[PDB]
C-alpha cells in the first residue's frame, strides 16, 4: 500500500487568514492527489483533484500544489463554514489510500458560556431515576470546567459531559453535563447546582435550584 | 506414449513450490508420478483429484534436470527452471492526468519480493469496446506505463489487462490475465 | 441532481453477516464506478473496493475476506456484504461513493453513510424526557429548553425540532456511553422567552434500530 501521511492532526486559524495543510506520500504518485473536505455531520466533499485542479463548483480560495511525494492544500482566506477535516488521497494506484486527516479549528475571541440548569422531569422521577442537566451554551475556547454540588457537597463519579463540534456560524462550542442519581438519593437532598469556570468568566458562575418550587 | 504438459509455480506459499501437470491427449479415461533431481527427497507421489496433480512441499531443488515418468508409461527430461508459471498480476489501475493529457497504468506482482523469480517482463493489452477481439499490446519491464491521449481514440472506453513472464535465468510460461480495468477518454 | 441513498443503520451479532444497499439516481448508473469506504472511530478513511455496474470488480487486500460487493442495474443499486463481523467492523461508518467519469480514481459523490454496530447486546428504544425552561433560569430575553434521550442502543438517533422547522439555536450533543452499556444524549434549543407562552415546541426523536418514532412536547413547568 501507498501510505499518505498528514503532518498535523489539528490546525487552528483566524477567519480571513491563510492555512496550508501538507501531505506526504511514501512513494512517487506524480501529480495525482485529491483533497476532500468533511464538515461536521456531513459526508466528504471532493474539493481538489490532480494536486492542483479544482472540482466544479469549488470556491477559488481552495488551491493545491505539489508533485511526487509532497503536496499542500491551501485556503487563502479561511471562513467560518470552512470548519472540517481535510483529507488527502492518492488516486494514483490500487489500493486507494487516504490520509489521516487534519481538523481545522477556528480561533476567535473569548466567549463566556451561558449557563442553564434543568431539574429532572416528574416522569423520569416516577420511573425511578433523576437526571439533572447543566447546559453551557455558545462559549469559546473549548475548555470549560463544570462541578456539581448537591447541598454544597461536591460530586464525583456520577456525572457525564458531552461537548458539540464547533458551530459554523459563531465558531463556539456547547457542553452538556448530566448528573445521574436515584429517586431515593434525589429526594434525599434539596439544593442542586452546577458551578462553571471558563477562560471568559472573571469568577465562577453557579446555577442552582431547590428541589420542588 | 501418452502426452502431457506440466508447469511449476515457484515461490508461491512462502518457498513451497507447486508442480502441476495435465494431459494433452483429449480422452484419457483411466479407472501420475514424477521423479528426478530433488532435495531431501528422491521421488514423491502426486495428489489425485480430477485431472490435475500437484504437491505443496518446501524441500525442493531448483538446480538440475528431472525425469518425469508417468505410471512406467511415458518419460520427459525437463528442467524445473524451464517450466515456471508466474503469479498473475493484480491491483491494475488507470489514472488520467488532466495536465499532461495521458493515462498512467499501474499494477503489482507478488514476485517482486520473491527470491528466485524476481525479474519479469509484462505484456499490457488494451482494447476498445467496439473492436471484436483486437488488442493493442505493449511489452514492458517496469511496473508503470504511460499512454498518450493523442494516441488514443477520443470519447472511447478502453479495457486493459496484463500478463507476465520470467525473462532472466528462468524460463517457463505466461501467467493468467489479471482482472480487467476500464477507463474513458475525454471528448476532444 | 445525483443521489446515493444508503440503507439505514444496522445492528448485528458477532460472527453474523450484514448487507448494506446504495441506490443511485440522477445519472446513467452503468457508466460510473462504485466504491465503498470505511470511516473508523479514529476518523480515518479506508477504501474497501470498487465495482463496475456493467459487470463487476473488487479490490483492497485487507477487505478480501470481509467485503463482497455486487450490483443490480434493474434497481440501480450497489449492494455490499460483510461476512465474519467483528468488534472492529462496527465503529465504522460505511459510505458508498461514485468514481469520476474517466476513471474510478477519485470520488466526486458520496452517500450519507450507514452506521454498523455488531454487539451481542440487544436493541433498546429511547426514553424521551423534557428539559423544561424554568422561568427563573433564563438569560435575559433568551430561554433554553430541550429533550433528554436516555437509555437506548445502538447508535444513532435522529433528533429534530418541530419536524425540522426549528433549526436556529439547536444543539444536539454527542451520545455518551453510560455504564449500563446504553447511550444517552441531550438536544437543547434557545428561543425568545416571550414566545414560551405563545409558541409550541415539540422535539421529534427517531431511533430506527428500535423503530421508535417519539414526539415530546416541552412546556414551561407551572407552579
Ligand atoms: C505491492 O504489493 C506489496 C506486497 O504487499 C506491497 O508491499 C506494496 O505496497 C504494493 N505496492 C503497490 C503500489 O500496491
| Domain positions in chain B | 1-85, 86-188
CB contact under 8 Å between C102 and B184, yes or no, is: yes
Q: Kindly state the cell numbers that stand for C79.
A: 449492494
**At what resolution in Å was this solved?**
2.9
**Cα-based distances in Å from C57 to B76, B144, C64:** 41, 21, 12
In order, the DSSP letters of chain A are: -PPEEES-SEEEEETT--EEEEEEESS--TT-EEEEEE-TTS--EEEEETTTEEPTT--TTEEEEEETTEEEEEESS--GGG-EEEEEEE-SSSS-EE---EEEEEE---BPPEEEEEPPPHHHHHHTEEEEEEEEEEEBSS-EEEEEEETTEEP-SSEEEEEPPPPTTT--EEEEEEEEEEHHHHHH--EEEEEEEETT-SS-EEEEEES--
- Chain C: give the shortest CA distance to residue B98, in Å: 10
- Chain C: give the shortest CA distance to residue A16, in Å: 25
A124 — phi, psi (to 5°)?
Answer: -65, -40
Let me know if the fold of B1-85 is the same as that of B86-188.
yes
Contact indicator for C187, C149 with CB cutoff of 8 Å: yes
- Cis check for the bond before B168: say yes or no (omega within 30 of 0): no
Contact indicator for C18, C81 with CB cutoff of 8 Å: yes
Fold type of domain B86-188: Immunoglobulin-like (2.60.40)
Which chains are adjacent to chain B, needing at least 3 Cβ pairs under 8 Å?
A: A, C
**Collapsed DSSP state (helix, strand, coil) of residue C88:** coil
Residue of A nearest to C104 (CA): A91
Contact indicator for A40, A47 with CB cutoff of 8 Å: no
Hey, which of B108, B109, B122, B178 would you mutate to test ligand 1's pocket, going by the most ligand atoms within 8 Å of its Cβ?
B108
Pairing of strands A97-98, A84-90: antiparallel
DSSP B39: S
CB contact under 8 Å between A92 and B106, yes or no, is: yes
The domain B1-85 is classified under which CATH number: 3.40.50.300, 3.30.365.10, 3.30.450.40, 2.60.40.1870?
2.60.40.1870
What is the CATH code for C121-223?
A: 2.60.40.10
- Cis check for the bond before C215: say yes or no (omega within 30 of 0): no
CA distance B162 to A100: 32
Place of cell 430561554: C143
Which domains can be identified in chain A, with CATH numbers? 1-108 (no CATH), 109-213 (2.60.40.10)
CB C216: neighbour CB atoms within 10 A? 17
Residue ranges covered by each domain of chain C: 1-120, 121-223
Amino acid at each position: 500500500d501507498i501510505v499518505m501521511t498528514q503532518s498535523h492532526k489539528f490546525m487552528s486559524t483566524l477567519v480571513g487568514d491563510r492555512v496550508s495543510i501538507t501531505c506526504k506520500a511514501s512513494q512517487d504518485v506524480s501529480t495525482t492527489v485529491a483533497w476532500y473536505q468533511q464538515k461536521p455531520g456531513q459526508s466528504p466533499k471532493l474539493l481538489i483533484y490532480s494536486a492542483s485542479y479544482r472540482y466544479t463548483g469549488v470556491p477559488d480560495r481552495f488551491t493545491g500544489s505539489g508533485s511526487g511525494t509532497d503536496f499542500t492544500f491551501t485556503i487563502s482566506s479561511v471562513q467560518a463554514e470552512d470548519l472540517a477535516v481535510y483529507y488527502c488521497q492518492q488516486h494514483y494506484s490500487i489500493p486507494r489510500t487516504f490520509g489521516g486527516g487534519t481538523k481545522l479549528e477556528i480561533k476567535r475571541t473569548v466567549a463566556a458560556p451561558s449557563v442553564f440548569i434543568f431539574p429532572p422531569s416528574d416522569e423520569q422521577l416516577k420511573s425511578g431515576t433523576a437526571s439533572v442537566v447543566c447546559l453551557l451554551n455558545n462559549f469559546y475556547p473549548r475548555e470549560a470546567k463544570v462541578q456539581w454540588k448537591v447541598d454544597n457537597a461536591l460530586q464525583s463519579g456520577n456525572s457525564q459531559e458531552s461537548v458539540t463540534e464547533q458551530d459554523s456560524k459563531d465558531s463556539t462550542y456547547s457542553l452538556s453535563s448530566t448528573l445521574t442519581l436515584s429517586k431515593a438519593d434525589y429526594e434525599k437532598h434539596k439544593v442542586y447546582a452546577c458551578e462553571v469556570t471558563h477562560q471568559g468568566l472573571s469568577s465562577p458562575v453557579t446555577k442552582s435550584f431547590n428541589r420542588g418550587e | 506414449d501418452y502426452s502431457f504438459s506440466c508447469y511449476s509455480q515457484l515461490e508461491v506459499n512462502g518457498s513451497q513450490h507447486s508442480l502441476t501437470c495435465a494431459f494433452e491427449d483429449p480422452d484419457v479415461n483411466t479407472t501420475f508420478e514424477i521423479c528426478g533431481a530433488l532435495v531431501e527427497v528422491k521421488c514423491l507421489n502426486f495428489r489425485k483429484l480430477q485431472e490435475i496433480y500437484f504437491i505443496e512441499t518446501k524441500k525442493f531443488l531448483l538446480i538440475g534436470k528431472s525425469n518425469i515418468c508417468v505410471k512406467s508409461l511415458t518419460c520427459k527430461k525437463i528442467d524445473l527452471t524451464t517450466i515456471v508459471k508466474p503469479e498473475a498480476p493484480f491491483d491494475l489501475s488507470v489514472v488520467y492526468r488532466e495536465g499532461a493529457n495521458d493515462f498512467v497504468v499501474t499494477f503489482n506482482t507478488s514476485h517482486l519480493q520473491k527470491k528466485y523469480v524476481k525479474v519479469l517482463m509484462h505484456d499490457v493489452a488494451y482494447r476498445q469496446e467496439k473492436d471484436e477481439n483486437k488488442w493493442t499490446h505493449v511489452n514492458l519491464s517496469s511496473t508503470k506505463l504511460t499512454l498518450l491521449q493523442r494516441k488514443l481514440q477520443p470519447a472511447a472506453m478502453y479495457e486493459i489487462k496484463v500478463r507476465s513472464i520470467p525473462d532472466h535465468y528462468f524460463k517457463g510460461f505466461w501467467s493468467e490475465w489479471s482482472p480487467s480495468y476500464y477507463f474513458r477518454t475525454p471528448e476532444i | 441532481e445525483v443521489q446515493l441513498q444508503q440503507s439505514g443503520p444496522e445492528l448485528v451479532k458477532p460472527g453474523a453477516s450484514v448487507k448494506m444497499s446504495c441506490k443511485a439516481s440522477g445519472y446513467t448508473f452503468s457508466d460510473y464506478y462504485m466504491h465503498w469506504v470505511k470511516q473508523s472511530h479514529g476518523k480515518s478513511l479506508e477504501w474497501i473496493g470498487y465495482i463496475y455496474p456493467d459487470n463487476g470488480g473488487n479490490g483492497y487486500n485487507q477487505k478480501f475476506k470481509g467485503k463482497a460487493t455486487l450490483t443490480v442495474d434493474k434497481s440501480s443499486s450497489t449492494v455490499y456484504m460483510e461476512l465474519r463481523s467483528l468488534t472492529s467492523e462496527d465503529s465504522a461508518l460505511y459510505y458508498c461513493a461514485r468514481g469520476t467519469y474517466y476513471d474510478g480514481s477519485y470520488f466526486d459523490y458520496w452517500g450519507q453513510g450507514t452506521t454498523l454496530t455488531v454487539s451481542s447486546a440487544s436493541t433498546k428504544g429511547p426514553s424521551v424526557f423534557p428539559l423544561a425552561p424554568s422561568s427563573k433560569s433564563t438569560s435575559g430575553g433568551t430561554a433554553a429548553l430541550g429533550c433528554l434521550v436516555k437509555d437506548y442502543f445502538p447508535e444513532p438517533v435522529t433528533v429534530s425540532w418541530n419536524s425540522g422547522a426549528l433549526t436556529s439555536g439547536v444543539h444536539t450533543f454527542p451520545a455518551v456511553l453510560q455504564s449500563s452499556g446504553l447511550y444517552s444524549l441531550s438536544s437543547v434549543v434557545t428561543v425568545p422567552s416571550s414566545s414560551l407562552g405563545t409558541q409550541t415546541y415539540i422535539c421529534n426523536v427517531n431511533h430506527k434500530p428500535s423503530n421508535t418514532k417519539v414526539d415530546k412536547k416541552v412546556e414551561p413547568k407551572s407552579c
